[PDB]
Scaffold this active site. Structure first.
Site, PDB file in Angstrom:
ATOM      1  N   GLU A 194      22.243 -36.691  62.063  1.00 38.59           N
ATOM      2  CA  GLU A 194      22.708 -37.494  60.928  1.00 38.59           C
ATOM      3  C   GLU A 194      23.020 -36.644  59.696  1.00 38.59           C
ATOM      4  OE1 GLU A 194      19.313 -40.152  60.924  1.00 38.59           O
ATOM      5  OE2 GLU A 194      20.570 -41.783  61.660  1.00 38.59           O
ATOM      6  N   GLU A 236      20.075 -41.554  70.972  1.00 38.06           N
ATOM      7  CA  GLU A 236      19.107 -42.574  70.593  1.00 38.06           C
ATOM      8  C   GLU A 236      19.620 -43.927  71.054  1.00 38.06           C
ATOM      9  OE1 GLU A 236      18.142 -42.282  66.344  1.00 38.06           O
ATOM     10  OE2 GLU A 236      18.578 -40.139  66.503  1.00 38.06           O
TER      11      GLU A 236
END
Ligand code: NA
Ligand code: NA
Lengths: 412, 206
Positions: free
Chosen positions: B50, B126
């Site tokens: 991220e 994820e």
């Protein structure tokens, strides 16, 4: 069997137009187009002989080209003395599509240098481009979504004889139901059909007359070089007859004949002779080297059907198979036999969700039912085995969205 | 995974698209590879998490590919399918539903595989968020995993709840989450997304 299509007499001059091909090239934004016209002659060549190609938009001429015969150098022996190519520049051409069938009239005129006409030939010209780019079939630069149907040439009273009234009826009924494409089911059609699709705006998949479904194995003849001449005739003559029609966007090598080396040879021949149209073929697993498009028959949206040698994957799983890059258009899907077309919404949800899922052709348009008469002289629809015919497949001939008299089914 | 996350930057690649932070990110990647390149359990290098997509990510991905060709490199930032990943590794992409966000669309994993020009395998870095009473629709993910070859699985988020032990007035221990220590603006119970409790007692989703 019989003489089921029209018989005619044609008178031509001794010096005559024997062949002509029209091609349309474009620039990136389609604001400029070039109409390439290749004309061939038969008879004795003369120096005063000329060919003029004029393009007409309604009553307005938009382009014209005149040249003597004699093409460019082809190889070490020269070029075609009995051929000529004209290049007509068209600025802001009106583009043909199924939504707007913009048509031009091209007139090919064989004439003397002083001006006297010998023979004129004409064809309708559509400016459109068909190509597969990055796994998508594009028309005029835009990805296509095929709303197609398979159509047989059937009449409940005349059998397999086609008339203009029934063709026009079929085309109007198709376009009124949001169909934009038609697959010529397993043979070249009546010549007027392609002209009508040019004028009205339907995309056409033109299929060679080659099916060997009952062979064991299915590629028994199509993998035999002793049948290559017959199949090659059936492919080459179809392409030669129909290569000028703008409605024809895809060539088909036939239907349900396995996969053999003859298919590969004929696919390569079509790609060499006419590069402007992709070639598809379903036999042999629908994803062989003889197709530009993965075109499975009745593959499902979400369920795989792993048959031993010719697996039928779900269309979403098929797209992502390792090494697969081609677009998927179902050559046959959503079997319309009787009370059918359940799960059609699932197919169209997948069509609109997956880019490379570019639609399909419904099987099929009209029931192949015939008219018999009872003891009271009243007509009724008949299917296989109602004529006493040797082992039949009963009602499996009626898979249409409309009845034989072109009355719609509820699935339409 | 390299110790590189800039989730709170606006935009997320503000520092990872700045060559003034390339030395710091390069240190954080190169020293990890140098320390751990001999371990057989390590099969995939990750550029971080991220941090958008910047030119620093491309440079460091290329550096890893040059120094250690024996392991693929993955990175999820910037849409999970950029030139800095060998594997499409979306965060919480769904099996059948697309999530078309303006610049970083989250396709369904089946649709992602078939996108024009796409050839890479898909492993979700994820998926199946295990916050509390969770993991509904896990069977759908695993049906897709076993049906699609290039769908090669994923990593569940995550293993253990990041809960801490506080003590009440009676001296008894209890599990605490964000904001239970008086800490400045917190994200409450979003620290507990594990398949097992902090003491490694399994949740029913395990
Ligand atoms: Na599509
Ligand atoms: Na898999």
């Amino acid at each position: 069997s019989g003489i089921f299509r029209d018989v005619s007499l044609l008178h031509k001059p001794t010096t005559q137009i024997s062949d002509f091909h029209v091609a349309t090239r474009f620039n990136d934004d389609f604001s400029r187009a070039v109409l390439e016209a290749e004309v061939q002659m038969c008879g004795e060549l003369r120096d005063y002989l000329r060919v003029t190609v004029s393009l007409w938009q309604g009553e307005t001429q938009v382009a014209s080209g005149t040249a003597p015969f004699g093409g460019e150098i082809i190889d070490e022996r020269g070029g075609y003395a009995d051929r000529v190519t004209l290049r007509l520049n068209v600025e802001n051409p009106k583009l043909w599509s199924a939504e707007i069938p913009n048509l031009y009239r091209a007139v090919v005129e064989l004439h003397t240098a002083d001006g006297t006409l010998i023979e004129a030939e004409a064809c309708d010209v559509g400016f459109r481009e068909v190509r597969i780019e990055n796994g998508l079939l594009l028309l005029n630069g835009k990805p296509l979504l095929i709303r197609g149907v398979n159509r047989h040439e059937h009449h409940p009273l005349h059998g397999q004889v086609m008339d203009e009234q029934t063709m026009v009826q079929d085309i109007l009924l198709m376009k009124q139901n949001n169909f934009n494409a038609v697959r010529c089911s397993h043979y070249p059609n009546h010549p007027l059909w392609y002209t009508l699709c040019d004028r009205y705006g339907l995309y056409v998949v033109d299929e060679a007359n080659i099916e060997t479904h009952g062979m064991v194995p299915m590629n028994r003849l199509t993998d035999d070089p002793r049948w290559l001449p017959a199949m090659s005739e059936r492919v080459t003559r179809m392409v030669q007859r129909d290569r000028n029609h703008p409605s024809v966007i895809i060539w088909s090598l036939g239907n349900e004949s396995g996969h053999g080396a003859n298919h590969d040879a004929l696919y390569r021949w079509i790609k060499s002779v006419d590069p402007s149209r992709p070639v598809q073929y379903e036999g042999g697993g629908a994803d062989t080297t003889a197709t530009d498009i993965i075109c499975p028959m009745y593959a499902r949206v979400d369920e795989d059907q792993p048959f031993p040698a010719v697996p039928k994957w779900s269309i979403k799983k098929w797209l992502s198979l390792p090494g697969e890059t081609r677009p998927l258009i179902l050559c046959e899907y959503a079997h319309a036999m009787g009370n059918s077309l359940g799960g059609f919404a699932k197919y169209w949800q997948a069509f609109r969700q997956y880019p490379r899922l570019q639609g399909g052709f419904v099987w099929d348009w009209v029931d192949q039912s015939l008219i018999k008469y009872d003891e009271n002289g009243n007509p009724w629809s008949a299917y296989g085995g109602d004529f006493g015919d040797t082992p039949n497949d009963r009602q499996f001939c009626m898979n249409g969205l409309v009845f034989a008299d072109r009355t719609p089914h509820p699935a339409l």
